[PDB]
């Protein structure tokens, strides 16, 4: 055990850094916070329908293997995180 929980793989690390995350190991809480921040400041969510994230053409969409996803049905987000966070 240690204080940090996960090490993101490179494309996810880039996303987290783009949102203002510092360093390269994190708690899962930090990963979720900065991923949300990224989506917020890249404005990938639909202004009208804000559960919908349009990530096609973004590195996040590359990672998800998807043009969009819903935060109300976040299972592909968790799929991606399971694949792109390496446990410490």
């Amino acid at each position: 055990i240690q204080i940090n929980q996960v090490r993101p793989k490179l494309p996810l690390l880039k996303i987290l850094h783009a949102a203002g995350a510092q360093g390269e190991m994190f708690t899962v809480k930090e990963v979720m916070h900065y991923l949300g921040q990224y989506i917020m400041v890249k404005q990938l969510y639909d202004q009208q329908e804000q559960h919908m994230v349009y990530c096609g053409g973004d590195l996040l969409g590359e990672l998800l293997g998807r043009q969009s996803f819903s935060v109300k049905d976040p299972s592909p987000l968790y799929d991606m995180l399971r694949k792109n966070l390496v446990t410490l």
Partner: peptide, 12 residues
């Protein structure tokens, strides 16, 4: 709803 409000509801 608000993106940040929905996002905050997500579990670990």
């Amino acid at each position: 709803e608000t993106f940040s409000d929905l996002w905050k509801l997500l579990p670990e």
